[model samples]
Target: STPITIQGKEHFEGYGSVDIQKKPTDLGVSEVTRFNVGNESNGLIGALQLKNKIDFSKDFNFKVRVANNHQSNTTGADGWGFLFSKGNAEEYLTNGGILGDKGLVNSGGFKIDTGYIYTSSMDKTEKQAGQGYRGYGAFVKNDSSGNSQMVGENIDKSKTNFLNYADNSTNTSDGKFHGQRLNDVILTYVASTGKMRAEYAGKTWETSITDLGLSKNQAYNFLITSSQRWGLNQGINANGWMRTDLKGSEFTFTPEA
Candidate 1:
Protein backbone atom coordinates (compact mmCIF):
# COMPACT_ATOMS: atom_id res chain seq x y z
CA SER A 1 0.00 0.00 0.00
CA THR A 2 1.11 3.59 -0.64
CA PRO A 3 2.32 5.63 2.32
CA ILE A 4 0.15 8.44 3.72
CA THR A 5 0.69 11.76 2.09
CA ILE A 6 2.38 14.74 3.79
CA GLN A 7 2.52 18.37 2.86
CA GLY A 8 5.89 20.13 2.63
CA LYS A 9 6.91 22.99 4.88
CA GLU A 10 9.79 25.43 4.80
CA HIS A 11 11.77 26.68 7.82
CA PHE A 12 15.20 27.47 9.26
CA GLU A 13 17.36 30.45 8.42
CA GLY A 14 20.83 29.02 8.86
CA TYR A 15 20.95 27.73 5.28
CA GLY A 16 24.11 28.74 3.42
CA SER A 17 24.83 29.40 -0.26
CA VAL A 18 27.90 29.78 -2.45
CA ASP A 19 28.74 32.66 -4.76
CA ILE A 20 28.57 32.27 -8.53
CA GLN A 21 29.78 34.24 -11.54
CA LYS A 22 28.17 37.41 -12.88
CA LYS A 23 26.85 38.12 -16.38
CA PRO A 24 28.22 40.37 -19.12
CA THR A 25 26.52 43.64 -20.13
CA ASP A 26 26.69 45.72 -23.34
CA LEU A 27 24.66 48.94 -22.77
CA GLY A 28 27.71 51.32 -22.76
CA VAL A 29 28.38 50.46 -19.07
CA SER A 30 31.68 48.84 -18.19
CA GLU A 31 31.95 48.33 -14.42
CA VAL A 32 29.71 45.40 -13.45
CA THR A 33 29.43 42.72 -10.78
CA ARG A 34 28.03 39.18 -10.88
CA PHE A 35 27.33 37.00 -7.85
CA ASN A 36 27.38 33.22 -7.89
CA VAL A 37 25.33 30.72 -5.92
CA GLY A 38 25.77 27.47 -7.89
CA ASN A 39 26.82 26.08 -11.24
CA GLU A 40 23.35 25.00 -12.33
CA SER A 41 21.60 27.31 -14.74
CA ASN A 42 17.83 27.75 -15.17
CA GLY A 43 16.86 29.79 -18.21
CA LEU A 44 13.09 30.28 -18.55
CA ILE A 45 12.54 27.37 -16.20
CA GLY A 46 13.85 29.29 -13.21
CA ALA A 47 11.30 32.03 -13.75
CA LEU A 48 8.52 29.51 -14.32
CA GLN A 49 9.39 27.66 -11.14
CA LEU A 50 8.76 30.82 -9.12
CA LYS A 51 5.03 30.01 -9.31
CA ASN A 52 5.48 26.31 -8.63
CA LYS A 53 4.06 26.32 -5.12
CA ILE A 54 0.49 27.15 -6.02
CA ASP A 55 -2.09 25.46 -8.21
CA PHE A 56 -3.32 28.39 -10.34
CA SER A 57 -6.53 26.69 -11.48
CA LYS A 58 -8.09 25.95 -8.11
CA ASP A 59 -9.12 29.40 -6.87
CA PHE A 60 -12.03 31.74 -7.56
CA ASN A 61 -9.82 34.49 -8.96
CA PHE A 62 -6.14 34.93 -9.75
CA LYS A 63 -4.54 38.17 -8.73
CA VAL A 64 -1.09 39.70 -9.09
CA ARG A 65 -0.04 42.27 -6.48
CA VAL A 66 3.13 44.35 -6.42
CA ALA A 67 4.47 47.42 -4.60
CA ASN A 68 7.02 49.02 -6.90
CA ASN A 69 8.54 51.49 -4.45
CA HIS A 70 11.59 51.81 -6.66
CA GLN A 71 13.03 55.28 -6.90
CA SER A 72 12.53 57.27 -10.08
CA ASN A 73 15.61 57.71 -12.19
CA THR A 74 17.30 61.06 -11.71
CA THR A 75 18.57 60.68 -15.25
CA GLY A 76 16.37 61.51 -18.24
CA ALA A 77 16.14 57.83 -19.24
CA ASP A 78 14.81 56.23 -16.05
CA GLY A 79 11.76 53.96 -16.31
CA TRP A 80 10.23 50.70 -15.05
CA GLY A 81 7.45 48.34 -16.21
CA PHE A 82 5.55 45.13 -15.38
CA LEU A 83 4.87 42.23 -17.79
CA PHE A 84 2.54 39.21 -17.54
CA SER A 85 2.29 36.40 -20.06
CA LYS A 86 1.53 32.71 -20.31
CA GLY A 87 4.88 32.17 -21.99
CA ASN A 88 8.34 33.64 -21.70
CA ALA A 89 9.46 36.87 -23.44
CA GLU A 90 12.03 35.23 -25.68
CA GLU A 91 9.32 34.01 -28.05
CA TYR A 92 8.91 37.21 -30.14
CA LEU A 93 10.39 40.24 -28.36
CA THR A 94 14.05 40.99 -28.78
CA ASN A 95 16.47 40.95 -25.85
CA GLY A 96 13.89 39.11 -23.76
CA GLY A 97 11.67 42.19 -23.49
CA ILE A 98 7.88 42.30 -23.80
CA LEU A 99 6.77 40.38 -26.93
CA GLY A 100 3.25 41.77 -27.19
CA ASP A 101 4.52 45.21 -28.22
CA LYS A 102 6.02 43.97 -31.45
CA GLY A 103 3.06 41.75 -32.12
CA LEU A 104 0.63 44.60 -31.49
CA VAL A 105 2.65 46.88 -33.70
CA ASN A 106 2.56 44.28 -36.42
CA SER A 107 -1.19 43.95 -35.99
CA GLY A 108 -1.81 47.70 -36.36
CA GLY A 109 -2.34 48.43 -32.67
CA PHE A 110 -2.43 52.09 -31.70
CA LYS A 111 0.92 53.66 -30.90
CA ILE A 112 1.00 56.35 -28.24
CA ASP A 113 3.91 57.92 -26.39
CA THR A 114 5.02 61.10 -24.65
CA GLY A 115 7.54 62.27 -27.25
CA TYR A 116 9.24 61.29 -30.44
CA ILE A 117 12.55 59.43 -30.77
CA TYR A 118 12.96 58.65 -27.09
CA THR A 119 12.58 55.11 -25.75
CA SER A 120 10.93 54.09 -29.02
CA SER A 121 9.44 55.97 -31.94
CA MET A 122 6.28 57.75 -30.66
CA ASP A 123 4.35 56.82 -33.76
CA LYS A 124 3.16 53.65 -31.99
CA THR A 125 4.71 54.00 -28.55
CA GLU A 126 3.92 56.56 -25.85
CA LYS A 127 6.85 56.53 -23.43
CA GLN A 128 9.90 58.61 -24.13
CA ALA A 129 13.41 57.20 -23.86
CA GLY A 130 11.78 53.82 -24.17
CA GLN A 131 10.38 54.83 -20.83
CA GLY A 132 6.76 55.25 -19.81
CA TYR A 133 4.08 53.87 -17.46
CA ARG A 134 4.88 50.70 -19.38
CA GLY A 135 3.76 47.30 -18.20
CA TYR A 136 2.55 44.01 -19.76
CA GLY A 137 -0.17 41.47 -18.93
CA ALA A 138 -1.38 38.69 -21.21
CA PHE A 139 -3.49 35.56 -21.39
CA VAL A 140 -2.10 32.68 -23.42
CA LYS A 141 -2.46 28.96 -23.94
CA ASN A 142 1.00 28.18 -22.56
CA ASP A 143 2.56 25.36 -24.51
CA SER A 144 5.72 24.48 -26.40
CA SER A 145 5.40 27.62 -28.54
CA GLY A 146 4.28 29.96 -25.74
CA ASN A 147 2.29 31.92 -28.26
CA SER A 148 0.52 35.06 -27.07
CA GLN A 149 -3.21 35.36 -27.77
CA MET A 150 -4.30 38.46 -25.83
CA VAL A 151 -2.37 41.23 -24.08
CA GLY A 152 -3.02 44.42 -22.08
CA GLU A 153 -6.84 44.31 -21.91
CA ASN A 154 -7.28 46.17 -18.63
CA ILE A 155 -7.32 49.58 -20.27
CA ASP A 156 -10.36 51.47 -21.64
CA LYS A 157 -9.59 50.65 -25.24
CA SER A 158 -12.02 47.90 -26.20
CA LYS A 159 -15.67 48.83 -25.78
CA THR A 160 -17.19 45.63 -27.19
CA ASN A 161 -15.06 42.59 -26.39
CA PHE A 162 -14.31 41.96 -22.76
CA LEU A 163 -10.75 40.89 -23.44
CA ASN A 164 -9.78 43.07 -26.34
CA TYR A 165 -6.38 43.04 -27.95
CA ALA A 166 -5.43 46.60 -27.22
CA ASP A 167 -2.31 48.30 -25.90
CA ASN A 168 -2.13 51.11 -23.37
CA SER A 169 0.69 53.00 -21.67
CA THR A 170 0.66 55.17 -18.53
CA ASN A 171 3.47 57.64 -18.80
CA THR A 172 5.20 59.08 -15.73
CA SER A 173 6.97 61.91 -17.55
CA ASP A 174 3.99 64.13 -16.60
CA GLY A 175 5.86 65.11 -13.42
CA LYS A 176 9.32 64.97 -14.98
CA PHE A 177 11.26 61.72 -14.97
CA HIS A 178 13.02 62.27 -11.69
CA GLY A 179 10.01 62.76 -9.39
CA GLN A 180 7.31 60.35 -10.62
CA ARG A 181 6.41 57.06 -9.05
CA LEU A 182 3.77 54.26 -9.32
CA ASN A 183 3.25 52.05 -6.32
CA ASP A 184 0.85 49.50 -4.85
CA VAL A 185 -0.62 48.36 -8.17
CA ILE A 186 -2.48 45.08 -8.66
CA LEU A 187 -3.12 42.74 -11.66
CA THR A 188 -5.65 39.94 -11.50
CA TYR A 189 -6.46 36.89 -13.68
CA VAL A 190 -9.12 34.19 -13.67
CA ALA A 191 -7.48 31.52 -15.81
CA SER A 192 -10.02 28.77 -16.43
CA THR A 193 -13.00 31.04 -15.93
CA GLY A 194 -12.02 33.92 -18.29
CA LYS A 195 -12.03 36.96 -16.00
CA MET A 196 -9.35 39.61 -15.50
CA ARG A 197 -9.03 42.82 -13.51
CA ALA A 198 -6.44 45.49 -12.72
CA GLU A 199 -6.17 48.32 -10.19
CA TYR A 200 -3.91 51.35 -10.26
CA ALA A 201 -3.96 54.81 -8.72
CA GLY A 202 -7.15 53.85 -6.80
CA LYS A 203 -9.02 52.76 -9.94
CA THR A 204 -9.91 49.34 -11.23
CA TRP A 205 -10.53 47.95 -14.76
CA GLU A 206 -11.91 44.56 -15.73
CA THR A 207 -12.63 42.29 -18.72
CA SER A 208 -14.60 39.15 -19.45
CA ILE A 209 -12.82 37.10 -22.12
CA THR A 210 -14.30 33.71 -21.61
CA ASP A 211 -12.69 32.25 -24.73
CA LEU A 212 -9.27 33.48 -23.68
CA GLY A 213 -9.22 31.03 -20.82
CA LEU A 214 -6.42 28.53 -20.42
CA SER A 215 -6.16 25.66 -22.82
CA LYS A 216 -7.40 22.27 -21.75
CA ASN A 217 -4.00 20.56 -22.02
CA GLN A 218 -1.08 22.95 -21.85
CA ALA A 219 1.40 23.80 -19.12
CA TYR A 220 0.69 27.47 -18.34
CA ASN A 221 3.26 29.76 -16.78
CA PHE A 222 2.69 33.40 -15.93
CA LEU A 223 5.61 35.77 -15.60
CA ILE A 224 5.40 39.01 -13.61
CA THR A 225 8.47 40.74 -15.04
CA SER A 226 9.73 44.20 -14.14
CA SER A 227 12.28 46.40 -15.91
CA GLN A 228 13.85 49.85 -15.48
CA ARG A 229 15.70 51.26 -18.49
CA TRP A 230 18.30 54.06 -18.41
CA GLY A 231 21.38 54.81 -20.48
CA LEU A 232 22.99 56.98 -23.23
CA ASN A 233 20.19 56.25 -25.68
CA GLN A 234 17.72 58.61 -24.01
CA GLY A 235 20.04 60.61 -21.73
CA ILE A 236 17.38 60.38 -19.04
CA ASN A 237 19.30 58.14 -16.71
CA ALA A 238 22.73 58.80 -18.12
CA ASN A 239 24.31 56.90 -15.31
CA GLY A 240 24.86 53.21 -15.95
CA TRP A 241 23.55 52.04 -12.59
CA MET A 242 19.75 51.62 -12.37
CA ARG A 243 17.72 52.28 -9.22
CA THR A 244 18.03 48.75 -7.79
CA ASP A 245 17.12 49.75 -4.27
CA LEU A 246 13.39 49.09 -4.74
CA LYS A 247 11.48 46.21 -3.28
CA GLY A 248 11.60 42.97 -5.25
CA SER A 249 8.42 41.76 -7.03
CA GLU A 250 6.08 39.54 -5.04
CA PHE A 251 2.84 37.95 -6.34
CA THR A 252 0.17 35.38 -5.46
CA PHE A 253 -2.47 34.10 -7.92
CA THR A 254 -5.93 32.76 -7.02
CA PRO A 255 -6.76 30.63 -10.03
CA GLU A 256 -10.34 29.88 -11.07
CA ALA A 257 -12.33 27.58 -8.85
Candidate 2:
Protein backbone atom coordinates (compact mmCIF):
# COMPACT_ATOMS: atom_id res chain seq x y z
CA SER A 1 0.00 0.00 0.00
CA THR A 2 1.27 3.51 -0.87
CA PRO A 3 1.12 6.14 1.83
CA ILE A 4 -0.82 9.13 0.57
CA THR A 5 -0.58 12.51 2.29
CA ILE A 6 -2.75 15.49 1.28
CA GLN A 7 0.34 17.73 1.66
CA GLY A 8 0.23 21.45 2.57
CA LYS A 9 0.87 24.97 1.11
CA GLU A 10 3.73 27.51 0.75
CA HIS A 11 6.23 28.53 -1.98
CA PHE A 12 4.19 31.73 -2.17
CA GLU A 13 3.17 34.78 -0.22
CA GLY A 14 -0.24 36.33 0.45
CA TYR A 15 -2.73 35.75 -2.38
CA GLY A 16 0.15 35.25 -4.87
CA SER A 17 1.44 38.22 -6.87
CA VAL A 18 -1.16 39.84 -9.11
CA ASP A 19 -1.18 42.77 -11.53
CA ILE A 20 -0.62 45.53 -8.96
CA GLN A 21 -2.47 48.05 -11.08
CA LYS A 22 -5.59 45.86 -11.55
CA LYS A 23 -6.14 43.24 -8.90
CA PRO A 24 -8.89 40.71 -8.23
CA THR A 25 -11.95 41.83 -6.31
CA ASP A 26 -12.26 41.17 -2.59
CA LEU A 27 -14.03 38.04 -1.31
CA GLY A 28 -16.49 37.73 1.58
CA VAL A 29 -15.26 36.55 4.97
CA SER A 30 -16.84 33.17 4.28
CA GLU A 31 -14.21 32.28 1.63
CA VAL A 32 -11.05 32.76 3.71
CA THR A 33 -7.91 30.85 2.64
CA ARG A 34 -9.46 31.29 -0.81
CA PHE A 35 -9.72 34.18 -3.30
CA ASN A 36 -11.44 35.15 -6.53
CA VAL A 37 -9.23 35.15 -9.63
CA GLY A 38 -11.71 37.14 -11.69
CA ASN A 39 -14.68 39.22 -10.55
CA GLU A 40 -16.36 39.68 -13.92
CA SER A 41 -13.52 42.08 -14.81
CA ASN A 42 -12.17 42.47 -18.33
CA GLY A 43 -8.48 41.84 -17.67
CA LEU A 44 -7.16 39.94 -14.64
CA ILE A 45 -4.00 37.84 -14.14
CA GLY A 46 -3.14 36.14 -10.85
CA ALA A 47 -1.57 32.98 -9.36
CA LEU A 48 -1.75 31.00 -6.07
CA GLN A 49 0.88 28.29 -5.48
CA LEU A 50 0.49 25.33 -3.16
CA LYS A 51 1.80 25.38 0.40
CA ASN A 52 4.06 22.35 -0.04
CA LYS A 53 6.49 21.42 -2.81
CA ILE A 54 5.35 18.38 -4.80
CA ASP A 55 7.47 15.27 -4.49
CA PHE A 56 8.09 14.15 -8.04
CA SER A 57 10.45 11.52 -6.70
CA LYS A 58 7.22 9.84 -5.60
CA ASP A 59 3.79 9.58 -7.21
CA PHE A 60 1.82 12.84 -7.05
CA ASN A 61 -1.88 13.61 -7.19
CA PHE A 62 -3.24 17.17 -7.31
CA LYS A 63 -6.89 18.12 -7.25
CA VAL A 64 -8.83 21.39 -7.31
CA ARG A 65 -12.32 22.60 -8.21
CA VAL A 66 -13.35 25.85 -9.96
CA ALA A 67 -16.58 27.84 -10.21
CA ASN A 68 -16.81 30.56 -12.85
CA ASN A 69 -18.80 33.81 -12.70
CA HIS A 70 -21.33 32.43 -15.25
CA GLN A 71 -20.26 34.99 -17.90
CA SER A 72 -23.37 36.86 -16.76
CA ASN A 73 -24.37 36.97 -20.46
CA THR A 74 -21.05 37.81 -22.14
CA THR A 75 -18.59 36.02 -24.44
CA GLY A 76 -16.09 35.94 -21.56
CA ALA A 77 -12.40 35.06 -21.67
CA ASP A 78 -10.40 31.99 -20.60
CA GLY A 79 -11.00 29.94 -17.46
CA TRP A 80 -8.53 28.91 -14.73
CA GLY A 81 -5.87 26.20 -15.28
CA PHE A 82 -2.98 24.36 -13.66
CA LEU A 83 0.61 25.77 -13.64
CA PHE A 84 3.71 23.66 -12.99
CA SER A 85 7.00 25.37 -13.63
CA LYS A 86 10.55 25.89 -12.38
CA GLY A 87 10.40 28.87 -10.01
CA ASN A 88 7.81 30.07 -7.53
CA ALA A 89 4.67 32.06 -8.35
CA GLU A 90 6.66 35.31 -8.18
CA GLU A 91 9.02 34.31 -11.02
CA TYR A 92 6.07 33.83 -13.36
CA LEU A 93 4.59 37.16 -12.27
CA THR A 94 7.90 38.77 -13.25
CA ASN A 95 8.94 36.91 -16.45
CA GLY A 96 6.85 33.81 -17.07
CA GLY A 97 3.64 34.63 -18.86
CA ILE A 98 0.69 32.51 -17.77
CA LEU A 99 -0.92 32.04 -21.19
CA GLY A 100 1.64 34.14 -23.06
CA ASP A 101 5.36 33.56 -23.31
CA LYS A 102 7.30 36.70 -22.48
CA GLY A 103 10.64 35.36 -21.30
CA LEU A 104 8.66 32.47 -19.86
CA VAL A 105 10.67 29.43 -18.88
CA ASN A 106 10.18 26.10 -17.19
CA SER A 107 6.40 26.66 -17.32
CA GLY A 108 3.73 24.22 -18.44
CA GLY A 109 -0.05 24.73 -18.40
CA PHE A 110 -3.42 22.94 -18.91
CA LYS A 111 -6.52 25.14 -19.00
CA ILE A 112 -10.03 25.31 -20.35
CA ASP A 113 -9.44 26.76 -23.85
CA THR A 114 -12.36 29.08 -24.47
CA GLY A 115 -11.41 31.51 -27.26
CA TYR A 116 -7.64 31.99 -27.50
CA ILE A 117 -7.36 29.03 -29.89
CA TYR A 118 -7.26 31.57 -32.72
CA THR A 119 -4.68 33.83 -31.08
CA SER A 120 -1.16 34.17 -32.45
CA SER A 121 0.35 32.28 -29.52
CA MET A 122 -2.01 29.28 -29.33
CA ASP A 123 -2.26 26.55 -31.94
CA LYS A 124 -5.40 26.91 -34.02
CA THR A 125 -5.75 23.17 -34.45
CA GLU A 126 -6.17 22.70 -30.71
CA LYS A 127 -9.84 23.61 -31.04
CA GLN A 128 -11.52 23.27 -34.41
CA ALA A 129 -14.76 25.09 -35.10
CA GLY A 130 -16.80 21.85 -35.07
CA GLN A 131 -14.73 20.12 -32.41
CA GLY A 132 -16.35 21.85 -29.43
CA TYR A 133 -15.46 24.80 -27.14
CA ARG A 134 -14.13 23.08 -24.03
CA GLY A 135 -10.98 22.07 -25.96
CA TYR A 136 -7.59 22.51 -24.23
CA GLY A 137 -3.84 22.58 -24.92
CA ALA A 138 -0.53 21.98 -23.15
CA PHE A 139 2.13 24.64 -23.69
CA VAL A 140 5.51 25.90 -22.60
CA LYS A 141 7.63 29.08 -23.35
CA ASN A 142 7.02 30.40 -26.82
CA ASP A 143 7.66 33.75 -28.62
CA SER A 144 8.52 36.17 -25.81
CA SER A 145 7.67 39.83 -26.37
CA GLY A 146 5.09 42.49 -25.78
CA ASN A 147 1.99 42.12 -23.53
CA SER A 148 1.02 38.66 -24.79
CA GLN A 149 -0.16 35.36 -23.33
CA MET A 150 2.00 32.32 -24.33
CA VAL A 151 3.07 30.08 -27.21
CA GLY A 152 4.50 26.60 -26.85
CA GLU A 153 4.51 23.11 -28.37
CA ASN A 154 1.58 20.77 -27.88
CA ILE A 155 2.60 18.18 -25.33
CA ASP A 156 0.52 15.39 -26.89
CA LYS A 157 -1.38 15.22 -30.12
CA SER A 158 -3.66 12.53 -28.78
CA LYS A 159 -4.15 14.59 -25.65
CA THR A 160 -6.56 16.82 -27.52
CA ASN A 161 -9.44 17.00 -24.99
CA PHE A 162 -9.54 19.75 -22.33
CA LEU A 163 -11.32 18.12 -19.36
CA ASN A 164 -12.06 14.44 -18.92
CA TYR A 165 -15.77 14.69 -19.76
CA ALA A 166 -17.89 15.26 -22.83
CA ASP A 167 -19.12 18.83 -23.38
CA ASN A 168 -22.73 19.96 -23.46
CA SER A 169 -22.51 23.29 -25.29
CA THR A 170 -26.29 23.69 -25.53
CA ASN A 171 -26.61 23.47 -21.76
CA THR A 172 -23.56 25.69 -21.04
CA SER A 173 -24.12 28.36 -23.72
CA ASP A 174 -21.40 30.88 -24.55
CA GLY A 175 -22.60 33.38 -21.95
CA LYS A 176 -22.08 30.85 -19.16
CA PHE A 177 -18.29 31.00 -19.53
CA HIS A 178 -17.26 27.65 -21.13
CA GLY A 179 -18.57 24.65 -19.26
CA GLN A 180 -20.57 24.40 -16.07
CA ARG A 181 -19.10 26.70 -13.40
CA LEU A 182 -18.61 23.81 -11.01
CA ASN A 183 -15.68 21.90 -12.57
CA ASP A 184 -13.31 19.51 -10.84
CA VAL A 185 -9.72 18.78 -11.90
CA ILE A 186 -7.55 15.84 -10.98
CA LEU A 187 -3.93 15.79 -12.24
CA THR A 188 -1.74 12.79 -11.64
CA TYR A 189 1.98 12.41 -12.26
CA VAL A 190 3.41 8.93 -11.85
CA ALA A 191 7.12 8.95 -11.10
CA SER A 192 7.63 5.34 -12.00
CA THR A 193 5.76 5.66 -15.30
CA GLY A 194 6.91 9.16 -16.19
CA LYS A 195 3.40 10.03 -17.29
CA MET A 196 1.09 12.96 -16.63
CA ARG A 197 -2.68 12.92 -16.94
CA ALA A 198 -5.43 15.38 -16.05
CA GLU A 199 -9.10 16.15 -16.59
CA TYR A 200 -9.56 19.11 -18.93
CA ALA A 201 -12.68 19.13 -21.13
CA GLY A 202 -13.11 16.21 -23.52
CA LYS A 203 -11.45 13.40 -21.59
CA THR A 204 -8.58 12.50 -19.34
CA TRP A 205 -5.76 13.84 -21.54
CA GLU A 206 -2.39 12.20 -21.13
CA THR A 207 1.19 13.39 -21.70
CA SER A 208 4.58 13.55 -20.10
CA ILE A 209 4.94 16.94 -18.41
CA THR A 210 8.57 16.27 -17.64
CA ASP A 211 9.11 16.33 -21.41
CA LEU A 212 8.64 20.09 -20.94
CA GLY A 213 11.08 20.01 -18.00
CA LEU A 214 8.61 21.14 -15.29
CA SER A 215 8.10 18.45 -12.69
CA LYS A 216 7.69 17.30 -9.13
CA ASN A 217 10.25 17.30 -6.33
CA GLN A 218 12.96 19.73 -5.41
CA ALA A 219 10.77 22.85 -5.66
CA TYR A 220 8.85 24.64 -8.39
CA ASN A 221 5.74 26.73 -8.76
CA PHE A 222 2.34 25.00 -8.94
CA LEU A 223 0.00 27.85 -9.78
CA ILE A 224 -3.42 28.75 -11.20
CA THR A 225 -4.21 31.75 -13.48
CA SER A 226 -7.36 33.31 -15.01
CA SER A 227 -8.45 36.19 -17.24
CA GLN A 228 -11.70 37.66 -18.46
CA ARG A 229 -12.62 39.39 -21.75
CA TRP A 230 -9.65 41.77 -21.68
CA GLY A 231 -7.72 40.50 -18.73
CA LEU A 232 -4.87 38.85 -20.68
CA ASN A 233 -5.86 39.42 -24.22
CA GLN A 234 -4.11 38.29 -27.39
CA GLY A 235 -5.94 40.54 -29.84
CA ILE A 236 -9.60 39.60 -29.77
CA ASN A 237 -9.89 39.70 -25.98
CA ALA A 238 -7.75 42.87 -26.05
CA ASN A 239 -10.96 44.87 -26.33
CA GLY A 240 -14.51 43.71 -26.46
CA TRP A 241 -17.73 43.93 -24.53
CA MET A 242 -17.57 40.34 -23.30
CA ARG A 243 -16.55 39.72 -19.68
CA THR A 244 -15.76 36.55 -17.67
CA ASP A 245 -14.46 35.59 -14.23
CA LEU A 246 -13.59 32.56 -12.04
CA LYS A 247 -13.43 31.46 -8.39
CA GLY A 248 -11.15 28.59 -7.28
CA SER A 249 -11.16 26.55 -4.11
CA GLU A 250 -8.14 25.53 -2.03
CA PHE A 251 -5.87 22.88 -3.59
CA THR A 252 -5.44 19.33 -2.30
CA PHE A 253 -2.39 17.21 -3.07
CA THR A 254 -1.87 13.44 -2.60
CA PRO A 255 1.45 11.67 -2.60
CA GLU A 256 1.91 7.90 -2.96
CA ALA A 257 5.02 6.14 -1.79
Judged by lDDT, which candidate is best?
A: 2
lDDT of 2 by residue, 119-198 (tens): 43453444323333343555443222323343333344563444322244555545443444345566777777767776
Q: How many pairs of residues collide in each model?
A: 22, 17
TM-score of each: 0.40, 0.60
lDDT of 1 by residue, 206-246 (tens): 54433333332333444323222311222223221211111
lDDT of 1 at 166: 15
lDDT for each candidate structure: 0.28, 0.45
